[PDB]
Paper text:
Glycine receptors (GlyRs), along with γ-aminobutyric acid receptors (GABAARs), are the principal determinants of fast inhibitory synaptic neurotransmission in the central nervous system (CNS). GlyR and GABAAR belong to the superfamily of pentameric ligand-gated ion channels (pLGICs). GlyR has a conserved pLGIC architecture consisting of an extracellular domain (ECD), a transmembrane domain (TMD), and an intracellular domain (ICD). The ECD houses the neurotransmitter binding pocket and the TMD governs the machinery for selective ion permeation.
In the GlyR–Gly/PTX reconstruction, in addition to the glycine density at the neurotransmitter binding pocket, an additional density was seen in the pore at the mid-level of M2 nestled between Gly2′ and Leu9′. This density was not observed in the other two conditions and likely corresponds to a PTX molecule. The hydrophobic isoprenyl end of PTX is oriented toward the Leu9′ and the hydrophilic end closer to the Thr6′. In the GlyR–Gly/PTX structure, the M2 helices are oriented outward with the Leu9′ rotated away from the central axis. The pore radius profile (created with the PTX ligand removed from the pore) shows an expanded ion permeation pathway at each of the constriction points seen in GlyR–Apo. In the GlyR–Gly/PTX, there are no residues below the line and the score is 0.0. Therefore, it appears that PTX exerts an allosteric effect on the intracellular gate Pro-2′ and prevents it from closing in the presence of glycine. In contrast, 173 chloride ion permeation events (defined as ions passing from end to end of the TMD of the intact receptor used in the simulation) were observed over the course of 1 μs (= 5 × 200 ns) of total simulation trajectory of the GlyR–Gly/PTX structure. This corresponds to an estimated single-channel conductance of ~20 pS (corrected to the value at 0.15 M NaCl) for chloride. Overall, based on the pore-profile features of GlyR–Gly/PTX and GlyR–Gly which show that there are no additional effects of PTX binding besides changes at the P-2’ position, and the MD simulations, which confirm that the pore conformation of GlyR–Gly/PTX has close to the expected selectivity and single-channel conductance, we believe that this structure may be close to the physiological open conformation.
Author numbering:
A (entry chain D), B (entry chain C), C (entry chain E), D (entry chain B), E (entry chain A): 31 to 339, 399 to 441
The structure:
């Protein structure tokens, strides 16, 4: 019967009165646009610059009174991806976006559909680097919230309003996991608005939730720091007759603790406030230091006993310091370590 | 006789009724497309971000009822690379793709052929960075699987279906080797499918297999860690009369072991679970530590003997600890090292 | 009534006598252009290369005698973003600009408006990397000034003059903070001019003010350096009977101080003059060194007493050095540390 | 007389029967193309990723029966660089190419010439990053071979064959030197061929030769490693009366040797086989270790003599070990160092 | 009177006989082009890859017999930046150029002027990364010469010749300074020529002069190395009675000197020849080593005296070595340090 290319030229082109530079249903209530977001591949989240790489598909549907053929026997039509200028897709930008170039492999990576009523389907895979203002109040637990702000640019609130969907809000790629964080399935979403000096613009957003999968942090720094503290404890028992060995153990244990505390913040961005690591390393450096101090006091009692040679009293005092020291370090460390964990587990359960 | 450019304009252009925006054999069974993949140069695999750089050639053949001249005396025709829009090549994208720009040196790097029946040949060299979800369950052996997902975008299962080839599936560049891994020639391949909220899309894949060429890992960390353990063993024999020297050997051996264990995970991505290196380094740090501990006990027996001066008994006990220690360390290390290797060689042979 | 696309073609196109390649009100006084700057997202400031990444919106208004319809009942019209060549927007470039590519997500990210009189509205989100000549006279306080130079290129002072606005000068994105610096709200602004060998060109600028949010610097280097100094002080009290231990403490404390002083300048760019850190580290390395020196003198008095065995006098002198040393170090350190802070707090209050 | 632009339009355009999409002398023997390569600037060779940056000029000449005016009085004509599509330059790609974008400063950086017979001249400066499979069998000498593979894409052996030149093959930029390697002037060249599954394609290549300019390697690692070995030798002579000092010298010399051996492979790519550095560092670490071992044996003889107090015999044995040790280390090191150099100098002279 | 756009279309377009693809004054003496260079912002000079980033403005003037209106009452006309193809600007490329993309902020960043006679003005801000072959014969002083080679591509010496200017040669941005180097105002300039295998091409150049602003280098490495040497000197005076302490001081001072000498060449590119730093560090490592050696000899005299117990003679010899050592080190260091500075200050004054 009729040719498909003849019908495609009759629908969009010189036969069509619309030039596509005018918004559909002009001088009428703004046409809402439904946006479904599918995450092709989450990951590559940069912690030192507070950003993340994600490619979404951005399928958007709107209705127009134009482009209603109502003469083909099927429900929808799969259009070419070379007719993108005739559709007049709406404007959309991200307000926290870095880079975000398009994709091009053998064609434009775009989808196009059109039904009898005018409901269209237009999805585009775009790799988006987005800046997120993560709050690193506690570095190991580190509940983070990542956002994406779907915003228009040039069409006001009384001209173009975006909206979400009701059958599914944000889908995710099947069988995708992240080593750094586990993606929460809550997918809390809502929408704000913008008030600039030129008008009222719509701003639709979506909030993600990322918690740290603990394990790596413990092996990398919690386990070495612990062993280092343990080494200091053994020093008292390791050396009794000769003092030098204890001195040098305590010196280099403090130096390697400061080296590890300096090396732990290399991947971290520069921030003013104090994290949990910056409490843990400081208190373990306090313990190792304090032990060395205790040692200085023991050598002072020994030097007083040497310059005196009350001999029994001095020996007794030294022995007492030695036997009280070693008993005291585990209880003051165990109570603190357990206390720290409880004071962070209960704030984790209060946050979650 | 007839001019070639006149025939080329008669075949594609104003004389041709097709505009090339319509799929061939429209309102008919989907035209399958045969895909042959040739790897120009594998390599540059990034371990810290789980990706790899590869340039394939992507020769794809399909048949159309149009573009059948049946008037030239030869079988096929070599077309210009400026007539790419007239062919209407099918859409194809990769679902795990980062970047992947085109190549441009003096022309478009594209091939074009057309036969009397309509079987075309279209290959394109594209440098593709693809993200692979490698599982680093054992870091030194590390059997990995890399995939490439040939997928359409805009044409459903009842509109366009891709397929593989039967005379050769994935070819590889002659005389190409990789320092990091040796490419398996098994080339296991199959194809999945996709079910989105818009329709059923085809997804053709191909699985590669990469195992680590062992050697470098052994020289870099297995040999230094071993020597370090050996150094600790010699300490007992190195120093008998004077205790300090043993103390300081054990301290710095533990500190350099923790330094090497911290420096070994710099190229590694942050991951929660425990690798074979994280067992080996932990057990060797246990051995070196344990030796230092044993030493603390020896100095405690020596200090008890000093504060007593049962003298013979104390000397005998110290001698016993010294002679049992040194006998015990090799057997408990050799049995463990051999055990570890057997428990990883048999899981390597069970995986392969 | 009349069609909107017919009116849009009548206003700009073949019906319009202007080709848009001629400046509005040609052979007349230069048309001034009002520029409002909104900072979408400040941050990612590079300290080692003296630059910063910022995306502004750059809304610019000018009046033209052309494009005055005076026939529609509304005040303004929202034009398409495909008619950008018909407006003839003015030239604008930044004189300290690196890179600064455009943005492209589904359309041109541009705004276009036109009123009855001719006052237009044109804003463009452009991610601008700008080079700022920061003066690092004092590294921890580090009051910096960042500038952006709005400059024309091709239109002289008697041809095109830019100007600022009176209802708001530079706006900023609501709820945006920077970890490195806190943005001052003073927003001091003025404008310079340029005199090249081709003519007089306008150059409009805006000055920002960035001070360091102190805290991170103190934890990272001030607290470790302090502890190191404290360790040296304890050495005198730690060891009295045996000299070696003090020697080795002082050696490695000097070596780790030089290591920390070398590692502190890794993020810093290479600069000739002396910062506050380069005074602090040098004076603390002086203190630790001086202590070791004092120690050398004590061992010289001890060796003189040994080669003599005036015995009482030598013992008294050694004791005196030991008791004067330890009293002297805190007062000469506390007076200096307080002095340094006062001499930098008062220059901070004099700068602010 | 006649206008030049009129003649340029008559030669190429609507008057010309060729559309330029057809190969010259179609249905005739393939037109060979002469390729002269000039290296504008060699350098920036990456060792960790096995690639190098080079910009060649790629002047290519071919003859066509068309475009023969034979009416101007001069020999050749210098055409515009905007008429590149009318010439129909042949296809050319590199089979080991990464990136390789074009250059653009104020025009297309292209040359165009045409003579009366039809011999054209077309050169293009293109910065080419090319991957070379260097074999690092011996790291310090390291004779490497870099290749460039000029290959067609779309025109078979019976359609288009490339060839080299006879008056000069590959020229090089005057007064250009490389710090890493000295470019050999031999410039050995030949050509292979390709056999794919679609046809026979020509592949013309050129081989370069790069040897390491020795010196830097010697200062950076050979001289420090030597000094370290020397330090170990002095230890025996440095300490005789007291054993600790020797113990600690040997410990830290082994630790700094392992640190230097770990730090030497940072710029190196990960490779399985053993280089000359990995023999040198291993044998010097063996020497330093062995010395420490010898020392353990001396302390065992000393402890046996202590637990005995045959006294003369034990003292004599210790003295003998001390005097045999120090005599033995230089001869066993000098013979080995000279042997290593001879066994690498003669394989260098056999390779060259 | 007459319209400006009508005159602009009459001057360039269909009324003009020239197509702009032909050089002005064809079959006549080559039109020279005057080039004035203004440096917008020098800086970001990379030392490890021998390059630098600079954006010049490149204002070029040439005369043509065409485009002479001689009918407007003014001297010059400010043309649009959309008519760049009608002017036929000459070709220009840089022979040592990497990257160098164009700038694009709201328009083309180009200037265009035309007078009654035909003298045009065309400037373009282009950020140019240029490779300079710096000779690092002496690393701290380091007089460097940076060049820019203005060269044509496609027009021979008898077709197009570039030239410099007489009223100003290379201008620089007012109030611009560089932390690394101070720009010399001599601005020595001349021009070479090129002789390829296709013809004689013009090549105009300009030489800059960059010397290091000394200060940073001294603080970073000269001051730490000095202190380290000083520490070694104090060792002799620090320890007299006990030998171990001196041994360990000398060991770790040699180890930290080798660490600092290894860490000093990290920013440096790999080069074969010997710099001033590689003499200074080697001679200071010689001094520290030599001191340790001297010490070995002292302990040998002490061990000979111990195995003898000529007693007075041995004590006297040891005392003599101790008192000659300490006197000798400053004079042999001061004479050398002063000598080195004089031998580099006089070669600096001979170079300048
Ligand atoms: C951390 C260092 C470098 C110290 C230094 O002085 C010490 O106390 C540490 C010790 O580890 C430990 C010891 O042997 C070392 C030595 O001789 O000095 C050094 C060695 C290496
Ligand atoms: C849920 C909702 O408010 N939907 C709106 C509707 O109110 C409005 O009339 C229409 C105009 O096209 O756009 C959509
Ligand atoms: C093996 C196979 O199924 N091949 C299919 C065929 O069934 C189908 O009829 C044809 C339609 O063009 O496409 C191809
Ligand atoms: C405040 C001010 O000077 N505004 C100027 C005005 O003087 C000038 O007449 C006009 C010309 O269009 O441009 C604007
Ligand atoms: C040396 C050589 O073989 N040159 C060939 C020639 O044989 C061939 O006839 C010609 C066809 O154009 O192309 C060239
Ligand atoms: C100083 C100089 O040589 N200027 C030359 C002139 O000699 C030449 O005649 C002219 C041709 O246009 O180009 C210019």
């Amino acid at each position: 019967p009729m040719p498909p290319s003849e019908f495609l030229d009759k629908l969009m082109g010189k036969v069509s009165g619309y030039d596509a530079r005018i918004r559909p249903n002009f001088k009428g209530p703004p046409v809402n646009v439904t946006c479904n977001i599918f995450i092709n591949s989450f990951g590559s989240i940069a912690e030192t610059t507070m950003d993340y790489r994600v490619n979404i598909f951005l399928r958007q549907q709107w209705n127009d009174p134009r482009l209603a053929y109502s003469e083909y026997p099927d429900d929808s039509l799969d259009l070419d991806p070379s007719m993108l200028d005739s559709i007049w897709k709406p404007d959309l930008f991200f307000a926290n976006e870095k880079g975000a170039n398009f994709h091009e492999v053998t064609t434009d990576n775009k989808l196009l559909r059109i039904s009898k009523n005018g409901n269209v389907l237009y999805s585009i895979r775009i790799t988006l680097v987005l800046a997120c203002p993560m709050d690193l109040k506690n570095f190991p637990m580190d509940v983070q919230t990542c956002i994406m702000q779907l915003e228009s640019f040039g069409y006001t609130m009384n001209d173009l309003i975006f909206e979400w969907d009701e059958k599914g809000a944000v889908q995710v790629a099947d069988g995708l996991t992240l080593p750094q964080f586990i993606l929460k399935e809550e997918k809390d979403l809502r929408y704000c608005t913008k008030h600039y000096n030129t008008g009222k613009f719509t701003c639709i957003e979506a909030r993600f939730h990322l918690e740290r999968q603990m394990g790596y942090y413990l092996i990398q720094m919690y386990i070495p720091s612990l062993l280092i503290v343990i080494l200091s404890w053994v020093s008292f028992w390791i050396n009794m007759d000769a003092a030098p060995a204890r001195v040098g153990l305590g010196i280099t244990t403090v130096l390697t603790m400061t080296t590890q505390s300096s090396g732990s913040r290399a991947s971290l961005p520069k921030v003013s406030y104090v994290k949990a690591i910056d409490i843990w390393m400081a208190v373990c450096l306090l313990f190792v230091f304090s032990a060395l101090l205790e040692y200085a006091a023991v050598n002072f009692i020994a030097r007083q006993h040497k310059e005196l040679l009350m001999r029994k009293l001095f020996i007794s005092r030294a022995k007492r310091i030695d036997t009280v020291s070693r008993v005291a370090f585990p209880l003051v460390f165990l109570i603190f370590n357990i206390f720290y964990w409880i004071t962070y587990k209960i704030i984790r359960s209060e946050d979650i």
